[PDB]
Amino acid sequence: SSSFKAADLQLEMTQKPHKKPGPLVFGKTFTDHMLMVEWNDKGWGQPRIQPFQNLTLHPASSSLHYSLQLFEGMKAFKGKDQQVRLFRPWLNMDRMLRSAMRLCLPSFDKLELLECIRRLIEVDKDWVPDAAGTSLYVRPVLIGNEPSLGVSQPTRALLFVILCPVGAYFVTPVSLLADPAFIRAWVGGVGNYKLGGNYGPTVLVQQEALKRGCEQVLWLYGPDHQLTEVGTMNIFVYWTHEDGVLELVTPPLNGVILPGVVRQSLLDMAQTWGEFRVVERTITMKQLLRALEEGRVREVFGSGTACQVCPVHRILYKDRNLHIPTMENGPELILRFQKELKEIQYGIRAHEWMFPV
Amino acid sequence: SSFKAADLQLEMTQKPHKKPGPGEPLVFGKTFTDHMLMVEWNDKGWGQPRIQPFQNLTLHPASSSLHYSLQLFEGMKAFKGKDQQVRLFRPWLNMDRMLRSAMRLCLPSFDKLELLECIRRLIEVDKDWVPDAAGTSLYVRPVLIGNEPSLGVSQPTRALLFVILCPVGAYFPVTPVSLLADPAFIRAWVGGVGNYKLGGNYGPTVLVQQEALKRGCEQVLWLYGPDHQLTEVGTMNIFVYWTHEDGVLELVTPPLNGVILPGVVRQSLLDMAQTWGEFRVVERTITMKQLLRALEEGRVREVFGSGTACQVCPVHRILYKDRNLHIPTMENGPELILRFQKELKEIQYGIRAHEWMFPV
Ligand SMILES: *Cc1c(COP(=O)(O)O)cnc(C)c1O
Ligand SMILES: *Cc1c(COP(=O)(O)O)cnc(C)c1O
Ligand SMILES: CCc1cc(=O)n2nc(C)c(C#N)c2[nH]1
Ligand SMILES: CCc1cc(=O)n2nc(C)c(C#N)c2[nH]1
Ligand SMILES: [Cl-]
Ligand SMILES: [Cl-]
Ligand SMILES: [Cl-]
What we know:
Chains A, B: Branched-chain-amino-acid aminotransferase, mitochondrial
Keywords: fold type IV, transferase
Bound molecules: pyridoxal-5'-phosphate, the ligand CCc1cc(=O)n2nc(C)c(C#N)c2[nH]1, chloride ion
Entry title: X-RAY crystal structure at 2.20A resolution of human mitochondrial branched chain aminotransferase (bcatm) complexed with a pyrazolopyrimidinone fragment and an internal aldimine linked PLP.
Order of helices and strands of chain A: EEEEEHEEEHHEEEHEEEEHEHEEEHE
Assembly: dimeric
PDB class: transferase
Oligomer: homodimer
CATH superfamily of the largest domain in chain A: Aminotransferase class 4, branched-chain amino acid transferase, N-terminal domain
């Protein structure tokens, strides 16, 4: 139905701007402004940019009772020329609309939201840092807001966006706990959408990981222990495959994998190089062990917006530590992926992937 | 530590809501009472509990309750008998379940008997909102949410516990319901969180419930596994009263193996039937193959869901792919259903004193 329009934006500037930072911790520091859009039985209201402020919700809000909530995560980068650019934001907009439809929340126009986000970033561009490795994290959210305890398609909703200046998350490698007792997502489920409900249950599992000397969780699937995701990151393996061919593999989008923007960007980059096989195929612990013993594994890493390419060096599997020679192999592929992404994101090389603010 | 009911502060309302009219029927979960329970937790532990005028919540925009679904809820009923005495039905079990949910989401622990007392005190304040016409009750909705103003996926250092109340009647206008049973839809899985009453389990079902409507059915029969196990009906547990394949008369409901929410009404129906000792009462997996066969052999007496909002819900039809299966629940009395409803009514409205009722 009829989406809100960036033409109808309403600006309300803060009366007292907040003092910028001077070691930015991920997701804790927020900027002066936010986008807010209300939806109800009269359709979408006018978007507005307003000072960062608390939400007022009815205590029966379906957002809080039945997890009618979804989110996105994407980054804006400030180049030398002081120009700010979003990385592949259309893909985030596409994913967000898919999430919306899955939870029966209102459809909106992807380009209208992008423009409202652009404007919001414009208003707050001084918050976008420019130091090496820094960026602005953009967190759009769409939540149901029905004031009723019936499990139902909501007739009210709020779409809002907040911004965080950020540095890194932690090229330092990580250890993973691989315990098949915990299952992140199931074929036929909603693991392939960026819905809040997929994340809350992982908190206890991440604590078990820390208590057991690991930093992230490696989510395994199926009776053949398929490697699916690392924490909130897609997983990649750079090895020589069972048929003697050097390749980059990541599991295919079969339902239990969130289709990451960085994931897709790395598959694209590597395909464009034309220097080795790039494939989407199931990866099992059985295959990984055999390859590790036969010395065919060069690099293992996770990919995601907050930690774009995360080296892995250890997997704790069936109480037995497995060493991953990632850091011993350069890590060349990882360093090469990081360099090209940096050149693109900071505008050193022009690229259609970037959207200027 | 825990908040204490001894520390309760009361703020009475200065804008009381007009209560539901005479010929104005109660719609489930839409009408709220005048007051609410509110308790905050942070690095200092739990603050003091407050009973306060029903009012909006004020949440930071990065609240982890809204980004990563750090949220759980409960649902239980208070019943007013003819002598105007209000009683809660087996609230201890909801308190137990709420605390398990909390631990699963790394949300803060609390004292079950302190929460129960705060809830009793809350209902006492709004006692006149408890209706007393037949089949009516007061639905009680506790909630516990994470409230970390941080975008990292982590254990919150701040939380919020609150409770709101609604006067209710029946969920639907003992008219049986039809169910959509399609194996494409998966509510929960072994190793997941289907056995906890966490907000994240419900949101994904809204779309599936719309497909049930679109295909002419009223609720979703959630199927699991290669063998199409019957797990749950909508937000209710499922029971089958049949003559099994070994020729024995039994009431069966799926076992608590991870994909089943352990209902209070479920447990109570098992307790009641087990206590009668008139037939076999088991927890065992139930498959579509088994149901299909039992229906063609006329061994099925009654099928029904159980849950707080619709305590004993008869089923008359199941649309399994294209096979429209008639369930003969209503032609069989429904004798067991009526018996369960009659006993529950006697216990709930205080006709017959019982250890299951907690007086307010
Ligand atoms: C967000 C996310 C990813 C990666 O997504 P990006 O779009 O690259 O940031 C991968 N797996 C899970 C489970 C995620 O939530
Ligand atoms: C709440 C619930 C039930 C039944 O719980 P009761 O405690 O009897 O009200 C059954 N199934 C699901 C999925 C539920 O959420
Ligand atoms: C989805 C936002 C987010 C939260 C969070 O705690 N993490 N942790 C990591 C390692 C990432 C990434 N990428 C991430 N991303
Ligand atoms: C959990 C509260 C609740 C919401 C809702 O939409 N429903 N629908 C039904 C049939 C029930 C029950 N029991 C129920 N219970
Ligand atoms: Cl997908
Ligand atoms: Cl009890
Ligand atoms: Cl259980």
